[PDB]
Each structure stands twice: as C-alpha cells, then as structure tokens.
Amino acid sequence: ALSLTADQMVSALLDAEPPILYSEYDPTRPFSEASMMGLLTNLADRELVHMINWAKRVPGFVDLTLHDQVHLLECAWLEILMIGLVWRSMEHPGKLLFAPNLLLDRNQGKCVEGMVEIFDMLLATSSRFRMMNLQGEEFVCLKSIILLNSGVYTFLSSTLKSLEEKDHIHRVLDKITDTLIHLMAKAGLTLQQQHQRLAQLLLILSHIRHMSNKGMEHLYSMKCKNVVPLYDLLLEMLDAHRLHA
Template sequence: STIEVGMNKGSQRKDRKSSSGGNTAAKGKRCRADSTDTTDSSTNGAGSGPPTKVCIKRGGGMKRLRSTFILDALQKADLPVLDSYHNHEVPLSRVHLLNTLIKLADRELVYLINWAKHVPGYTDLSLSGQVHLIECCWMELLLLNCAFRSMEHEGKRLVFAPDFLLDRHLWDVMGMSEILEQVSAVSEQMVHNVVTKEELLLLQATILVNAEVRRLS
C-alpha cells in the first residue's frame, strides 16, 4: 500500500445558453473545470427568473481534504529536535565528533520509526516491508532534517542538534566533507525555494514510500 499522490482532475466544462423570445441568450458563469460541475435549476411557475447556475464541488475539495488528512497524520508524530549532549570540553577529534553523531542518530532513529507508522499506508505493509523501507532511507531522512534546521546558516554550517553545530572545517576533521557538502547544498536549495515545515513533512513521506526503488547493495 502506498500514499495516493493524485486525484482525478476535473469534470467536463459545460457552457449552456438560455434564450427567451427574441432576446439575446445570456451567458452563464463557468465553474472551474478541475473542481466543479455546473447544472441548471429554476423555480416553477410564471414569471420565474432565468435558470441559475449551481456549482458542485468535486475534485478540488477532495484533493484539499486528502492533503489535510495526510498532513494531520504526519504532524501527529513530527520528529523532535534532540540535543546531542556533546562534551565540548574534550578536544575536537574525528573519533569524538563521530561518537557524538552516532549516538545522536541512534536516538533519532527511534523517533523516526514511530513517525513512519503515521505515514498513511505504511503499517499496511508486512513487518519486513516496513523494516526494509526504514533501512533504505533512514540516513537520507535524518540528513534532510539536518538540512532543514541549517537553513538560517545558508550552507556555512550544519545543525545536527541545538548543541552540536558543525562548521565546514570540522567536516574535514570527521572525514565526511563530501557527503556534508551535499547536505549543505540541499539546505541552500531549501532557502532558495523557501521550503516550509509542511512541505518538509510531505517530502519526508515521499522519500519513505519511494525507498524500495533504491535497494541496499
């Protein structure tokens, strides 16, 4: 089972004309094709006015309802921002920095698994299927969140936790400069596109449900 990502677009647009005697036909208002249909209705009896146009909400309303449902589900288990408890009194070294990062990722992974269960359709999968999706994309999801938290720094530093901000020179110390440069680039693109929290949640869900196309080697 996967998240539905589209709705049927629109109903057919109907233009109708009404005429009386020698008068010119009056043009009716059109309803939006992707969200409404149009029907004629009039009251019975002499002297009644011209038919009125009734707009019936269809695709657009359902699409908004579906989007709201998905966002509400994702926000119920939004990933928290955890402290790293990094010991800043210890001299910086590759081992010390990586040790902090690994411990932080272990704790974040617990919340990530709980969050995934709120993605519509995820728990319909077998247990092995759920595990497979998490295995395929957990690091990508954690780094995506790091990129989002780092937007205010415009690619100059990465915010792994409120107490664990890493400047560029520390990326080399950790031996992770190549991958962290990519995370920084993603963060800069988020700034450029003014990515919102709601968009981040939907992007996370998209990554999760598409993870099976990138099998672990």
C-alpha cells in the same frame, strides 16, 4: 491515507513529526577531546528509534506487512536523517545543525577523513531549500515520499501479497502528490507554478538519494557500528507487542 483528505494528510504528517534531539557530551569540557564521529553516530542512533515511531504514524505505512516496513526503512533511513538535517540547517547558512547544541561548519568536517565532501553536499542542499523557501508542510510530505519511495523498486520476489503492497504504496504516494499540489494551490501559485514547484521538490530527492549513497560508502569504512545486521534491529523495533497499550 487513501480516503484521508489533503488537509488530513498534512495534519497527520505534522502531528507525526519526531522530536529534535540533543548531542550527548559534557558542555563543561573542551572539544578537541571529543570524537566528532562518536558524537554524530550517537546522535544518529538515538534518532532511529524516533524514526520508527514517526514512520508508524505516516498514513498507510502500518498497513504494510512487517517485512515490507523493515525493507523501506532499511533503504531510506539515511536519506530520512539527511533531509531532517538539511531542514533544520536551512536557517543557518554555511552550517549544519546536527543538534541545537551541535552546529558545525565545513571546516569542522575536515576533522574526519572524507567527511567534508558529505558536509559540502548537505550544505548545498540546505541552501537550495532556503533558495526555494521550502515550507514545513512541504518538507513533511517530502520526508514521507522518501520513506515510501526509496525501497519500493527493490522488493525481491513478486507474490500476490507483494503486488498488493506495491499497489498500496503507489496509491499513498499519489495522495501525497495530491497533498503537495493542494498546499501549493492554497498558497496562491498558478497551475504552472504548481507543477514546476512539484518537479523542483521531487528532483531534490534525487540529490538526497545521492548523498545517502555516498554517505553509506563513507560510513562503510569506519568504526561506526555494524553489530547485528540492520534488518534484524529494525525488525525488533518495528515488531512490537501491544502490551503497553
């Protein structure tokens, strides 16, 4: 990640992309009888296992301690799901493609109290991506930045080890910045367009943080799931043996 080229980061990031999952409900049955939140929650929980997989393939992530890996994912998981959703919704104006067999419009979000507000924010982000003509190569860089950036300011303590971890993370972030600029230059943007586009992309990440924060507030008031704290469940998942090697 720190000696990988900009072309190697791009291909590592493309190679690491997770699969597109489907909603799990019987399509031979009516819809009024489905719990929309139940459908969405079940989807999101299944994505989380693939997210851990993906994160381990982001250059530099697994060189972190297990504790720091847990922290970053605990901080970024909803942001990561949401940029993923906005990305596959890009080509579907006015709709969110939760899954290939679960495409919802804003009125379908009114079904859940306080959810249309979140839908509207996601929908607006999807339209901005569309207006910017965001590219697959740029999107994977952005998702990796979310993973590494979102919880890097909240590491508690400040041990020697902790200091080293922070330095490495900021080093990897620098390399993804170099990769985004490289992508843009390749595409034929001027120096000036490059830095402007870089800023445009990075400023969207402030909106994705906003959506995550608002979505956590909204989720935190519902059946959803809050069994076994998230840290411990992430740890479990990340603290793998290497027996099935």
